[PDB]
Amino acid sequence: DFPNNKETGEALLTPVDATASSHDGNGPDRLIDQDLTTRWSSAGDGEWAMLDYGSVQEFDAVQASFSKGNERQSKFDIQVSVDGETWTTVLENQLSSGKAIGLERFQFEPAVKARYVRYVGHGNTKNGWNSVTGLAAVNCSINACPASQIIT
Ligand code: NA
Known part of the structure; x- marks a missing residue:
């Protein structure tokens, strides 16, 4: 329902760091390796993975691909922050498609300011694992927001 999305755009920004509250050895670096x-895997409610873009940028969406994303739906929020201390929830009570292993986009408007973007997990529809194979913040005004990342 965002009709101004385009199929091409500028390169996605590369995070300067990717961190997590915890993980099982499958660390948050595995979010940003295309x-x-x-995967990043961490069990439990509220575990998080955070991308630091190094400076304040504008974003209106995330793209994320989910472990076993064709078998179960992952539950999550997305938060952003300018300073890494005060957080704003931009997407709440999100649910992945349960229908694909590739990238899925979760978009809002308008774009907001953020240096730091974080995925706050609430497990999945089968169990408590947060297991994500890819995460990136994007800006559909300047980056591609392909129709193929709307799953249905
Ligand atoms: Na990965």
Whole structure:
């Protein structure tokens, strides 16, 4: 329902750091490697993974791909922050499609200011695991927001 999305745009920004509240060895670096075969995994409600973009940027969406994303739905919020201390929730009570392993986009408007973007997990529809294979913040005004990342 965002009709101004485009199929091409500028390169996605590269985070300067990716961190997490915890993980099982499958660390948050595996969010940012453009590889569906690697994941961040952390069990429990409220565990998080955070991307630091190094400076304040504007974003109106995330794209995320989910472990076993064709078998179960992941539950999550997205928060952002200018300073890394005060957080704003931009997406709440999100649910992945449960219908694909590739990138899915979760978009809002308008774009907001953020240096730091974080995925706050609430497990999945089968169990408490937060297991994500890819995460990136995006700005649909300047980056591609492909129709193929709307799953249904
Ligand atoms: Na990965």
